[PDB]
């Protein structure tokens, strides 16, 4: 209960606020984290706890305090997390991010570990699943000392490995990684993506069981960004099984949510406005995995097996062994 500046272990104060004030810990520590000394180890722990929770407004202000600090380790943590947030907010390109990180450099085992994990999030975001798979082999947990950060990174990696297993069509392994992230984490973001991934593995097996997993993930979808993603997953699930879709996004310019609205229009029969959506997406820079879905939706409209051919190539280029079964199945029906 000492003043904010001379705190010794956040890992003790955090374990008493989530058990006492669990429903309001975001606003409580949004004021407490900013009063910590940016030169101490506690302030460096706060940027990781704020970012794992994706309290983006809080994270961006802790980073400013770390960058403007004058302890070399805090400056290193602040700059690495700064590049991480830039990749999240699409204000720097991945090709320019790998060049930045080269000229400094990094010497703490935590930020040397997180530098590679950060890239795995970007690889996931732009559908470069070959680089994500291979990068995870360079994450060695034996280089990290035991403590608060290591357990937090273990949670991050459990969910990265769940998506690697999903992309490789290892559904049981993906569910095991997602279940271990749930059993050993209390962060809403971790639990949300765990149940989002569980549901993704059941999209083609059973509609209800996939929806049961997304329903659990709704309980952790307080972040409106997470809400938009769960809506897109439920929109994609409703379009696959041809069920009532109450999650169609009409007010968004995101490539993936625009595709899902076009997917919805295809199932409705509004070919004119499904084509118009796919028409404008042709002027957008879609990643290799988005282009796999894009040409699959094009094939459902034009019946051209060459559209399914190019969908498959794009799915193999991004190394997606799971959703590639959508164009493959649609031509097995054609003969």
């Amino acid at each position: 209960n000492t003043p904010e500046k001379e705190m010794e272990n956040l890992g003790g104060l955090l374990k008493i606020v989530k058990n006492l004030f669990p429903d309001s810990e975001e606003q409580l520590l949004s004021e407490y984290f900013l009063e910590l000394d940016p030169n101490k180890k506690c302030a460096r722990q706060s940027v990781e706890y704020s970012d794992i929770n994706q309290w983006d407004t809080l994270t961006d202000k802790i980073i400013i305090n770390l960058c403007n600090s004058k302890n070399s380790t805090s400056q290193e943590w602040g700059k690495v997390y700064s590049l991480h947030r830039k990749l999240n907010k699409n204000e720097i390109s991945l090709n320019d991010a790998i060049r930045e990180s080269g000229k400094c450099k990094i010497k703490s085992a935590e930020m040397l570990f997180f530098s590679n994990a950060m890239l795995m999030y970007a690889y996931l975001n732009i559908g470069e699943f070959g680089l994500m798979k291979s990068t995870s082999k360079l994450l060695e947990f034996d280089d990290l000392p035991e403590g608060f950060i290591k357990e937090s990174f273990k949670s991050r990696v459990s969910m990265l490995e769940a998506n690697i297993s999903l992309n490789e069509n290892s559904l049981l392994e993906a569910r095991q990684h997602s279940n271990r992230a749930i059993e050993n984490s209390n962060v809403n973001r971790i639990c949300f993506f765990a149940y989002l991934t569980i549901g993704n593995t059941l999209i083609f097996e059973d509609y209800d069981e996939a929806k049961k997993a997304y329903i659990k993930g709704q309980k952790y979808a307080k972040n409106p960004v997470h809400q938009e993603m769960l809506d897109g997953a439920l929109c994609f699930l409703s379009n696959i099984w041809k069920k009532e879709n109450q999650w169609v996004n009409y007010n968004s310019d995101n490539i993936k949510y625009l595709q899902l609205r076009a997917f919805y229009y295809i199932n409705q029969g509004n070919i004119e406005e499904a084509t118009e959506i796919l028409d404008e997406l042709s002027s957008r820079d879609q990643d290799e995995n988005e282009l796999g879905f894009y040409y699959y939706y094009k094939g459902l409209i034009s019946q051209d097996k060459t559209d399914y051919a190019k969908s498959i190539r794009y799915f193999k280029k991004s190394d997606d062994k799971y959703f590639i079964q959508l164009p493959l199945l649609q031509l097995e029906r054609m003969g």
């Binding site: 998506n163 993506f193 993704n200 993603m229 769960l230 899902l260 879905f293 894009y294």
Partner: peptide, 6 residues
């Protein structure tokens, strides 16, 4: 497109 996340 399906929605993935970690």
């Amino acid at each position: 497109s399906a929605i993935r996340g970690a």
